Design an enzyme around this catalytic site. Structure first.
Site, PDB file in Angstrom:
ATOM      1  CB  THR J   9       5.419  -3.383  -2.121  1.00 50.41           C
ATOM      2  OG1 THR J   9       5.675  -2.708  -3.357  1.00 50.41           O
ATOM      3  CG2 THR J   9       4.884  -2.393  -1.099  1.00 50.41           C
ATOM      4  CB  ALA J  57      -3.871  -4.818  -1.566  1.00 49.48           C
TER       5      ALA J  57
END
Lengths: 262, 203, 118, 212, 208, 208, 197, 197, 197, 208
Positions: J9, J57
């Site tokens: 990301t 995550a």
């Protein structure tokens, strides 16, 4: 003292090196550097059971690879007044693992007031060696006379045991034990047994690379304990022809300090 | 594994005289970082030890041995016989037999009562052995037995002993990349200790 | 597998390799007396009845709590003839004898940890 | 499978003023046993050149059997005899011909130059010659050499003069060095063969050495 | 992967004696129990081999073909054992250098020009001569007795040589994993080559 | 087998207004045992060029020999001296022909020709970089810094000789493979001339 | 290392071979691969040479303790259960194939098997060992029912002598021993006493 | 990687550094002081694996203040070195494959200055001028060439400047600017940063 | 590693470079022109594995002059690209594990300039501004942000200067100075080198 | 099992005279299949700090939850707000407790306190570097250059917002994992305030 300790220390074999040792070995294996070695003294050991007592013997060379580290190293230890053992391979381990049992048997004998029996030594050695499954290698030849009669044992580095009338253990052993297989007969005499074991150990010492120098015998007959060392000298070093000694002033010097003691 | 650093030590028994010598060098493989790094420790007064091998374990084993020697000396009263330190170091090394150290110590000294010279040696994990004439151990172990066997002689006076220990090292240690550049000679006669520093090839 | 639910006092020990045993002779050497006692207790409980292990282990507990304080060496003269190792000298007392401990903790901390208060 | 195995041996060569000496122990040992005790390791090539070949005893024979054939070819072609200055390059070329499958040998060449002069060459398994004066080598090397370095060419000695090597000294030194170095090594011993060569031919010599 | 046991042999006053076991081992099982391992290549040289058996068959065919061709030509010349030994050494070395080794180990003995010859041709290109020899696993057990007797006495006669080989068979049968009661023998004295067999070995297990 | 020779070494060469200077050590190691002390590394191929040595020993010697043969053939054919660039590219092609099989060499072919000086560099990797300041081998570092600090391209002859001696000595004092002797080579219009040879001990004594 | 047992009326027989080795080399020429646990139950061995000894020692310990605790002669099923429980619990590094047999006052004559893996089951004839796979056909085709001591001994001698020659691990003397209602008698077959084939 | 050097003298232990960070292909920060402070007279340089360096230095730094605050006086450089080495060895061998290099400093009041070199296996030397990182290879010879046994404080800065210029000119990486600190018998003095435009 | 960029325009194929060498830890030479030349209108940038780059460039460069010298006229950039790609693919797949990156250039006389991007598996695109090496990651966004579809020759140099300043400030390596060449309908023009003090 | 989430990301944060600004994308990939489009990554732990998300995550979410619990406990105990440095060091210790078992996280804890702003950085490696300009994740590059070129430390508010939007858009146009939405966060004395959310398509349309 210290500020980061909670529990009391505990004795025994420490293990706070293998984590570093593994990575260091991995680093040094692919770079072609020197490697550690131990005194893997592959030596011939012989023992026979004649009419009265037992006769032991082993060679006295102690190598640490391809270089002769020692020319006189006793391969026969002391355990009790009438029990002797022998070692083979990784002499560092065999020395301690025989001394421990010797001390334990001495304590038992002191607590009992009578001479120990070989089966006790066999049991203790078997128990210890099987407790340390592998990772410690000391082939032994345990022999000794007791109140019942002559005995002999052939402990292996994993815990196996036997009761042979003759045994030969070590790196170079096939020659000596084949000599035994050819010449041995039941119920021999003392001097004949000594000659036979000397001949077998001589064949083993000549026809091998891991053995050399002097030999010795350990007659342990019923009412007479003998320990002959050395027994026979098969090889004798020659003599140096030309003198190569250096005289005074041959070597230089940079600094020098003298301090007197008392 | 005794190539990450360098070292070489001898010991010769003469006539009421013992000599121990070492080589001063400390370097990380090819590189070199210093020229002065002691490898001879003054345990007792007429006794010495000659640790040689991987340095990071040499320091630790020297510290632990000095600690235990001080403890025994203080508790038991009088000095330590040379044979006792042999079993001392044997036990200390076998303490970590499975996690082995990297040291090949050499012990050389005199009996405080009899003044009879004594020399011994040790392997990596502790296997006591005593040789009468001489002993040697170190990284360059192979290229010293040949130099020492011929040059040796029994019943040597201190001067010839110093000459022999100098000649068996000075031109026998330069035949190797690591473990060079300086030689310390410790001669221990009956009454006074004496230290000398030789000079060798600076390469 | 526990979350936090003083680092200077206890520090510098990564979680990585305590759940990764060292040289295979690790669980057979760090915990040896406990394993031998457990095996003997199981054998006695199987062959002789349920009374013997309970009695012997509670005897162990009774005799254990009369030694000196943890920050000093324990003679352990008793509990030895009762254990059965009265003369079984081995690789437990000649190597790294606890009397000459190389490192030593604070007295109050060690005694309060022995009490289990922490 | 592994197309390599060790067989021990030791080669020593002293190149004096007008004499070359090549000597070698004689024992074929592999693994831990002994195969024989005669096994000479000093073969003659010409009337004034001797070759000593240590190392694995499966190529020590092939190179010996090839060098003589190539020498015969050269003699027939050019109507002469190869001097010791060309055999070095020729053997180096043969050795390097198989750089991707190296020969496991450690060869030593000794002989006389065009004029009466000592000369001893020295190779490596891949093959690269280099002139020397007292070079030794083989299986039990690193022990023979330092003593010769101390004796032949005076090094790390001061206030000592320089004297040329006499023939009487050379054999006395070689025998002493082999006797000293036989004890501490495993692969050496048994019988010793000396092939001292001068400007009148090749003469042999055999003495006992740590009888085994 | 049939395998042999030992093809040991000793020199002799005018002759050579070679012995071998008529066995074939399929790893551990004893698959075959009558195969032979001694050859009669010509009138003055014999042969013995160990290790694999198919390669022994192949070299048997090749060498017999070579010797029969040479005899058929006709010149008053034959193959001295030294030449056969050199040929075997060269063949083995050439096969080794090509990464296709012949898992074999042979003994060549003969008596020509009033002298005896005996050699070793190990697959890695090893060749030499000796007063005595052993092959395979016999290099540790069979050799020492022969070496000791030869060092004590460098020259022998037929009776003691035969008894020495008999004793060596006795000990080897006693203490080897792959062995058989029967075994072959063949002398190469100047009369010719006389293959003899099968034989037997009387044993004693009184120390049981 | 064992390690061939020369696990590492040192050398340097810089160019200035009076030609090209070449310096080298002599210690052909074999991993952990010193094999020799006076092995020449500045390879002569003709009285106009000066081949260098590094990396392996046998490979370097063989390829310099082939380069010398090719240069001599070209000289005999075209009646004109060959430029340094042509020889450098030739050696580059020959070495790059074999890659990945274990070749290892560093050479610094240099000399004088119609275009002036020239000090092209080639190795087993295949690049043919030029330059005015070079040093290859294990002991190239520990000398690179000093010889870069001292270089000024306007030096005299004696100053350049002293700079080269200092650089080699300081490199070999700190390393563990270089040492032995120091060979110094000069290049001019009439070909190279050998300057001098020296021992490390004397330089250390005089620089102390 | 061939081991086999056969059950007949009133007792069982038990044989073995003494050629314990260490690979391609013979370790001991003659041994006693037949341990007399207690006084009636007998336990042979296979597999390794140390784990079997340790298991036998532990079994001797526990079974002697149990027998002297109950003040009654032991039952062979107890020995089989003890061997099973000891072997199965340690089924990671205890490669030791064992066969036990003996006689008891109640339902005398029992032959039990317990191969590697700790499984336990009873069968009329038990065979186990590395060189104990070449006589399955012979023993299946020859073993009838209703035989007394003499022909059982002869059958065991023949069946063991057959594999005694067609293997490398086996070879040497034979150690027949028969446990019956009254006591234990042992004998050794050596030399030509061994049937040819 | 990084760069650490320290030159001794008559009464100073002058040390340089390299204010720089690290990442995959990126420079996160261009001024990251690596010079942890022990006391009023002791510095501690440390370059090693990321995270472990800043953890070990922090742990060994919040342990020397305890000694001063518990005994009134202050440690000595030799004791600090022989303590840091012991902690590093015990912790590294215990459970963590560390990789940290250290370079102690300090000026006591009895024997001049003191500079200690330590590798990642916990050794201890007393070199008069050491180096770390990769620039050691290219700069140690330069340091050795001009190093007179006695160097004035004025000339030490010039020698350091030359030794850093050579590194900035002949190195692969982009060490943009360096820090300089000199210790005397007055505390921890500071000098203007060395920045190359 | 290295750095290669090229920006298109109305009538130019301006390309930068990085005059630098490589080694283990050392910079052998600080000015090594990577820009091989094909003809009066074609350049060829090439960064890859050592040796293979200078060999492949030489082989593909002493092959375009043959076409001119054998047919009078000159190749076109599209033909040069479609020939270089074919040669690279055939040779790489044949027997050599190459690793070479290329960046063609050129200005024909019918359709403006032409810049071609090629990876090491022999692909062929026609991007208006491409990059190679590791600096591509940190500089391609900067090139894309200010890139108006039409850029004057004066502003192209300024854009390149900013794109190189960012790389010189935020990169690990020490690319010290860059070369600049611009191609127009007059031959191969040259500009002063970009050097950062 | 399968790849958990979020292989990569992007995010960035710079500080200037009016606080600290945080920007982030939203695309939690699973190797080669897009799992979601509007996963929030700017994690709120209290109205004074702004946790960030990167790397894995689940690990990031769990450790921010633990940090929030510890911060709340400290707030309730000592009646005083906790500084950013304390929280950063706490998270550093917790993450460094486990290393080598596969942890992977990049967080950029930032906020206002008594000492002004602060934007300390911590990750799985263990370093706790500070700074004034940061960007982590796969798409950190392609944005680092632009946001370094535009930063001036004397910007206004709208200019800073536009700079952040441009940086994120140019990063996500060239990468292959970033994209989706753009979240913009501001920090001041009275805690953070959410600025705006936007879609990539509209920004591309208005920036074309």
């Amino acid at each position: 003292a210290a500020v980061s300790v909670y529990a009391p220390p505990v004795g025994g074999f420490s293990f706070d090196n293998c984590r570093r040792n593994a990575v260091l070995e991995a680093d040094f294996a692919k770079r072609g550097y020197k490697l550690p070695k131990v005194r893997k003294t592959g030596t011939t050991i012989a023992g026979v059971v004649y009419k009265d007592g037992i006769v032991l013997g082993a060679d006295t060379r102690a190598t640490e690879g391809m270089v002769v580290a020692d020319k006189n190293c006793s391969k026969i230890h002391f355990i009790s007044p009438n029990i002797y053992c022998c070692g083979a391979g990784t002499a560092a381990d065999t020395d301690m693992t025989t001394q421990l049992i010797s001390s334990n048997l001495e304590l038992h004998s002191l607590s009992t007031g009578r001479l120990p029996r070989v089966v006790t030594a066999n049991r203790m050695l078997k128990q210890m060696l099987f407790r340390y499954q592998g990772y410690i290698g000391a082939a032994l030849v345990l022999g000794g006379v007791d109140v019942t009669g002559p005995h002999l044992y052939s402990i292996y580095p994993h815990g196996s045991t036997d009761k042979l009338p003759y045994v030969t253990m070590g790196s170079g052993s096939l020659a000596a034990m084949a000599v035994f297989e050819d010449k041995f007969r039941p119920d021999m005499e003392e001097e004949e047994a000594k000659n036979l074991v000397s001949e077998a150990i001589a064949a083993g010492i000549f026809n091998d690379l891991g053995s050399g120098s002097n030999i010795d015998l350990c007659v342990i007959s019923k009412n007479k304990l003998d320990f002959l060392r050395p027994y026979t000298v098969p090889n004798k070093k020659g003599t140096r022809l030309g003198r190569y000694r250096c005289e005074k002033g041959t070597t230089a010097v940079l600094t020098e300090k003298i301090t007197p003691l008392e | 594994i005794m190539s990450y650093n360098g070292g070489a030590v001898m010991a010769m028994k003469g006539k009421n005289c013992v000599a121990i010598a070492a080589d001063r060098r400390f370097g990380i493989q090819a590189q070199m970082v210093t020229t002065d790094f002691q490898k001879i420790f003054p345990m007792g007064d007429r006794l010495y030890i000659g640790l040689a091998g991987l340095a990071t374990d040499v320091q630790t084993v020297a510290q632990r041995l000095k600690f235990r020697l001080n403890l025994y000396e203080l508790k038991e009263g009088r000095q330590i016989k040379p044979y006792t330190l042999m079993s001392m170091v044997a036990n200390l090394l076998y303490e970590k037999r499975f996690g082995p150290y990297y040291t090949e110590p050499v012990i050389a000294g005199l009996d405080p009562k009899t003044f009879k010279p004594f020399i011994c040696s040790l392997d990596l994990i502790g296997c006591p052995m005593v040789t009468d004439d001489f002993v040697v151990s170190g990284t360059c172990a192979e290229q010293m037995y040949g130099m020492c066997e011929s040059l040796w002689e029994p019943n040597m006076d201190p001067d010839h002993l110093f000459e022999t220990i100098s000649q068996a090292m000075l031109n026998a240690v330069d035949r190797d990349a690591v473990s060079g550049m300086g030689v310390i000679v410790h001669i221990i006669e009956k009454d006074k200790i004496t230290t000398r520093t030789l000079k060798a090839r600076m390469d | 597998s526990p979350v936090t639910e003083d680092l200077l006092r206890k520090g510098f020990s990564c979680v990585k390799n305590e759940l990764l045993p060292s040289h295979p002779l690790e669980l057979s050497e760090k915990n040896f007396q406990l394993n031998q006692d457990k095996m003997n207790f199981s054998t006695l409980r199987n062959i002789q009845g349920l009374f013997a292990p309970l009695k012997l282990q509670m005897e162990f507990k009774a005799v254990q709590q009369v030694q000196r304080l943890p920050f000093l060496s324990s003679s352990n003269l008793s509990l030895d003839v009762l254990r059965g190792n009265d003369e079984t000298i081995g690789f437990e007392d000649i190597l790294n004898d606890p009397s000459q401990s190389e490192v030593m903790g604070e007295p109050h901390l060690m005694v309060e940890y022995k009490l289990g208060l922490l | 499978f592994s197309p390599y195995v060790f067989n021990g041996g030791t080669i020593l060569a002293i190149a004096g003023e007008d004499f070359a000496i090549v000597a070698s122990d004689t024992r074929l040992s592999e693994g831990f046993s002994i195969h024989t005790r005669d096994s000479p390791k000093c073969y003659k090539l010409t009337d004034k050149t001797v070759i000593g070949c240590s190392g694995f005893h499966g190529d020590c024979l092939t190179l010996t059997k090839i060098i003589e054939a190539r020498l015969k070819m050269y003699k027939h072609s050019n109507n002469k005899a190869m001097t010791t200055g060309a055999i070095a390059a020729m053997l180096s070329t043969i050795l390097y011909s198989r750089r991707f499958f190296p020969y496991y040998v450690y060869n030593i060449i000794g002989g006389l130059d065009e004029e009466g002069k000592g000369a001893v060459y020295s190779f490596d398994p891949v093959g690269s010659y280099q002139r020397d004066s007292f070079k030794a080598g083989g299986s039990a090397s690193a022990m023979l050499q330092p003593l010769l370095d101390n004796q032949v060419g005076f090094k790390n000695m001061q206030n000592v003069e320089h004297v040329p090597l006499s023939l009487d000294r050379a054999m006395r030194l070689v025998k002493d060095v082999f006797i000293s170095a036989a004890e501490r090594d495993v692969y050496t011993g048994d019988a010793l063969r000396i092939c001292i060569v001068t400007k009148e031919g090749i003469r042999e010599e055999t003495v006992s050495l740590r009888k085994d | 992967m049939v395998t042999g046991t030992s093809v040991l042999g000793v020199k002799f006053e005018g002759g050579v004696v070679i012995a071998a076991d008529m066995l074939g081992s399929y790893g551990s099982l004893a698959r075959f129990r009558n195969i032979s391992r001694i050859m009669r290549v010509n009138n003055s040289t014999m042969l013995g081999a160990s290790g694999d058996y198919a390669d022994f068959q192949y070299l048997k065919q090749v060498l017999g073909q070579m010797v029969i061709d040479e005899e058929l030509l006709g010149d008053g010349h034959s193959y001295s054992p030294r030449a056969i030994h050199s040929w075997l050494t060269r063949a083995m070395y050439s096969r080794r250098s090509k990464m296709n080794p012949l898992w074999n180990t042979m003994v060549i003995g003969g008596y020509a020009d009033g002298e005896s010859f005996l050699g070793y041709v190990d697959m890695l290109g090893v060749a030499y001569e000796a007063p005595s020899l052993a092959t395979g696993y016999g290099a540790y057990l069979a050799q020492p007795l022969l070496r000791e007797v030869l060092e004590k006495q460098p020259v022998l006669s037929q009776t003691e040589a035969r008894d020495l080989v008999e004793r060596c068979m006795r000990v080897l049968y006693y203490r080897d994993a792959r062995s058989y009661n029967r075994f072959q023998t063949a002398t190469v004295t100047e009369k010719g080559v006389e293959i003899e067999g099968p034989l037997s070995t009387e044993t004693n297990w009184d120390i049981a | 087998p064992g390690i061939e020779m020369l696990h590492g070494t040192t050398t340097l060469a810089f160019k200035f207004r009076h030609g090209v200077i070449v310096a080298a050590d002599s210690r052909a190691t074999a991993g952990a045992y010193i094999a020799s002390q006076t092995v020449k590394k500045v390879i002569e191929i003709n009285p106009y060029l000066l081949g260098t040595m590094a990396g392996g020993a046998a490979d370097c010697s063989f390829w310099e020999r082939l380069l010398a043969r090719q240069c001599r053939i070209y000289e005999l054919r075209n009646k004109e001296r060959i430029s340094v660039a042509a020889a450098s590219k030739l050696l580059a092609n020959m070495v790059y022909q074999y890659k990945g099989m274990g070749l290892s060499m560093g050479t610094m072919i240099c000399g004088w020709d119609k275009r002036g000086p020239g000090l092209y560099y080639v190795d087993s990797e295949g690049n043919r970089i030029s330059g005015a300041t070079f040093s290859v081998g294990s002991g190239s570092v520990y000398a690179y810094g000093v010889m870069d600090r001292g270089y000024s391209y306007d030096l005299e002859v004696e100053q350049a000789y002293d700079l080269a001696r200092r650089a080699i000595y300081q490199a070999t004092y700190r390393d563990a493979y270089s040492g032995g002797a120091v060979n110094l080579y000069h290049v001019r219009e009439d070909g190279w001339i050998r300057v001098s040879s020296d021992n490390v001990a004397d330089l250390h004594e005089k620089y102390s | 290392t061939t081991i086999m047992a056969v059950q007949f009326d009133g007792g069982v027989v038990l044989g073995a071979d003494s050629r314990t080795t260490t690979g391609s080399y013979i370790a001991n020429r003659v041994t006693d691969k037949l341990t007399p646990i207690h006084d009636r139950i007998f336990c042979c061995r296979s597999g390794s040479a140390a784990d079997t000894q340790a298991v036998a020692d532990a079994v001797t310990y526990q079974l002697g303790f149990h027998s002297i605790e109950l003040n009654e002669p032991p039952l062979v099923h107890t020995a089989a259960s003890l061997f099973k429980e000891m072997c199965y619990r340690y089924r990671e590094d205890l490669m030791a194939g064992i066969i036990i047999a003996g006689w008891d006052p109640q339902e005398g004559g029992q032959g039990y098997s317990v191969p590697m893996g700790g499984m336990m089951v009873r069968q009329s004839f038990a065979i186990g060992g590395s060189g104990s796979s070449y006589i399955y056909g012979y023993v299946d085709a020859t073993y009838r029912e209703g035989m007394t001591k003499e022909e059982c001994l002869q059958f065991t001698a023949n069946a063991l002598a057959l594999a005694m020659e067609r293997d490398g691990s086996s070879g040497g003397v034979i150690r027949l021993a028969a446990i019956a209602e009254s006591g234990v008698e042992r004998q050794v077959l050596l030399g030509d006493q061994i049937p040819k084939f | 990687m990084e760069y650490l050097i320290g030159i001794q003298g008559p009464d100073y232990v002058l040390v340089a550094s390299d204010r720089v960070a690290a990442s995959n292909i990126v420079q996160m920060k261009d001024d990251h002081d690596k010079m942890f402070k022990m006391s009023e007279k002791i510095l501690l340089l440390c370059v090693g694996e990321a995270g472990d360096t800043v953890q070990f230095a922090e742990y060994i730094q919040k342990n020397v203040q305890l000694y001063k605050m518990r005994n009134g006086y202050e440690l000595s450089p030799t004791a600090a070195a022989n303590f840091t080495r012991r902690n590093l060895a015990d912790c590294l061998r215990s459970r963590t494959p560390y990789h940290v290099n250290l370079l102690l400093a300090g000026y006591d009041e009895h024997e001049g200055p003191a500079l200690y070199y330590m590798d990642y296996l916990a050794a201890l030397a007393k070199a008069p001028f050491a180096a770390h990182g990769y620039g050691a290879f290219l700069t140690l010879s330069i340091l050795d060439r001009y190093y007179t046994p006695t160097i004035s404080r004025e000339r030490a800065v010039e020698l350091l400047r030359k030794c850093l210029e050579e590194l900035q000119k002949r190195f692969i990486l982009n060490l943009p600017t360096f820090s300089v600190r000199i210790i005397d018998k007055n505390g921890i003095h500071d000098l203007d940063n060395i920045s190359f435009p």
